[PDB]
Design a protein around this ligand. Structure first.
Ligand SMILES: Nc1ncnc2[nH]cnc12
Ligand SMILES: Nc1ncnc2[nH]cnc12
Ligand SMILES: Nc1ncnc2[nH]cnc12
Ligand SMILES: O=C(O)c1ccccn1
Ligand SMILES: O=C(O)c1ccccn1
Ligand SMILES: O=C(O)c1ccccn1
Lengths: 272, 273, 273
């Protein structure tokens, strides 16, 4: 069933690209600008790959970019799939399985997030150090295939210690402040209330988003090393909370994206 | 994408029994159906006769759409609601809100029965809902978004209307009734909460707990309706001294709070509509 | 509404294999299946031969219904259970509890393997479950309610029976075993929790965390059964000093707590009401 769908997706991709990627990449809302850094051999539309969904959130372009960044073979999802769209988490996380099958060792994931920690600034890039999953579904529910990963994956260090060390070293070299923090995943699609933001803060979250955790969960099950970043697109201070609109979010995401466009190319040669 | 057609199919049928253009919609909760008597009624439409409307299976929920006038203000009321815990999707639960918005309603007034977690509450208090926490495991807006109904990512910084709640307080005060404001937490039910759960809910910042309302509010906000919300405290939820609760006691307390609402609502409607 | 039919069909087949009238039902968790050797069996029934029973797929869960006498008490024991994370609905998970009620059991004894969140716990501790927090994303009682089976809104003020736990403690002290009381939180799994998540579960008031049990307790309470619950602490979950966990170690610690329950349970059973 699952691994057979994985094998078919990868069998096809091999026929469109002879590359063996070291790093797999997932790029978030308003962060699609990052693909411009890649020397692209091929862009594979999601339809040409057996068992792939559809990207419908604005700014998510929806295609599989294959090539090289600083001479490091890579595969990048420019635009992702979201639970709030109506995709199952199996559908959301299938591209991760495919990256594993292609032979990537590391998944880099980026997203746009609300800043709950008051020490954050607008357009900060945060290094994800840990997460809290508050989504009402889990991508590993179902029969487990031990050829894919264990029944009970350990989550004591889902974000690679060595990768984040490198990410910090680069940030400092570039003179960029990248704080580390905890990412909380919620379903969406609505934004949070004032009272929900107070609760998430109390529970330990520094940023909140509607993605990423499902993919991280699947990456860890599959034995991939993870580096995640959040761009703080809006501030979520419940005692001074302003209405958020998608277009402002995309603007601030672009400024954070400019910073990742500096960081990521310096990071990749140092982690692979 | 076929929802907009479901909405029109239901709306047109409703118009074939009623002439009105309601300015306010109202949803009445457990033990609070009696509030419908306040309306000078043109017709009461059973949910059976409306395309795509669910059925109410909970005790005291009458299952009818009351259309009429309250204090000269045209109005539509759900006498009895639908809950997630009955087996309805949140799309089903919140369908009437879409229908109400289509009918032309500007404001949604929602009422519910709730457990009192804040120890300053008293039995039969009418709380003015100032904000909420959604602990339900589904979201009624999940799935494709139709931009003609609302935005993909609705803002929730002010789900309960500021001016509506200000009017609700002034009326309370001129009537001499204490209506505290606070935070409503929606959980799925159908079981009531454990002692350890009540402690956690309080710590999370909830003042009252219920098994409804939040889905309808989410959909109301997405649709651009202004919301006014009230919880009647039907049972006290203090974990160091929690007594068994039974449905029949909850209905009795609900009635004393309803009688308070039956005084508050007709005085509020003309000042917000 | 057709669940009774499924219940009768399963209770009929079981009477065909065993004419016993069980006083107690027992659910044996991960690595605890050895507790079934305490039963002087009359019959072991594979779940596959019982109408409507699912299949146990986690290691250590044998997937047999064990019927007999445990120190003189007629009993039915699930040697191995079902889990939401396996892809079962909670209706399927808890069907065996409905069956137990229909066979006549008055008390459900539930066991599980858990993570120890409270820093006062030790490895292999056997904890008396005093209350729970349900963080599962589905509820086994959602859907139409059959009054013949239980109330629409069960009370959860004392899910774990006060007298049963008092007897568990009396017997623990007689045997010289330390059995602390605490709150169990149920999460879906199947991944273990992150460090941030362990902190949050502590803050919410959890003492131990597991991936089962709560759905069965819910149904038990709905069905009028008295519940006695025990968690075996199989791994410690301190976020500032968290070590990776493998199922293999868990199973080894479970057996050590399992040895202790092997002593407790046969002493407790003849003493509870
Ligand atoms: N405030 C917020 N809440 C949830 N997801 C987000 N993504 C970006 N901002 C967010
Ligand atoms: N204690 C309680 N918990 C959840 N919903 C309720 N509705 C009325 N009382 C309640
Ligand atoms: N750490 C843990 N988390 C959740 N369930 C468990 N069962 C045993 N150990 C566990
Ligand atoms: O490493 C960090 O970014 C950090 C340090 C102190 C507090 C929060 N974050
Ligand atoms: O009685 C009060 O004043 C009260 C009630 C609820 C919350 C806060 N205060
Ligand atoms: O009875 C107990 O086990 C107990 C007492 C005090 C604190 C925690 N647990």
């Amino acid at each position: 069933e699952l691994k057979s769908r994985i094998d078919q997706a990868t069998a096809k991709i091999s026929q469109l690209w002879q590359g063996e990627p070291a790093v797999g990449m997932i790029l978030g809302t308003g962060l699609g600008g990052l693909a411009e850094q890649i020397e692209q051999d091929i862009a594979i539309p999601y339809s040409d790959i057996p068992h792939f969904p559809t990207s419908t959130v604005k700014s998510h372009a929806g295609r599989l970019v294959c090539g090289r960044l600083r001479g490091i073979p890579i595969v990048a999802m420019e635009g992702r799939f979201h639970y709030y769209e109506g995709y199952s988490l199996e559908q959301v996380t299938f591209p991760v399985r495919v990256m594993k099958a292609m032979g990537v060792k590391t998944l880099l994931v980026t997203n746009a997030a609300g800043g709950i920690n008051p020490q954050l600034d607008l357009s900060d890039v945060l290094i994800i150090e840990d997460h809290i999953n508050l989504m009402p579904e889990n991508p590993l529910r179902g029969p487990n295939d031990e050829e894919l990963g264990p029944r009970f994956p350990d989550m004591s260090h889902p974000y690679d210690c060595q990768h984040m060390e490198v990410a910090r070293q680069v940030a400092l070299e570039l003179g960029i402040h990248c704080p580390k923090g905890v990412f909380v995943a919620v379903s969406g699609p609505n934004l949070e209330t004032r009272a929900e933001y107070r609760m998430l803060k109390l529970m330990g979250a520094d940023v909140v988003g509607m993605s990423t955790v499902p993919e991280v969960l699947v990456a860890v099950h599959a034995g991939l090393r993870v580096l995640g970043f959040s761009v703080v697109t809006d501030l979520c201070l419940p005692d001074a909370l302003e209405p958020v609109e998608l277009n402002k979010i995309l603007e601030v995401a672009a400024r954070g994206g400019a910073k990742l466009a500096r960081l990521i190319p310096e990071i990749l040669p140092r982690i692979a």
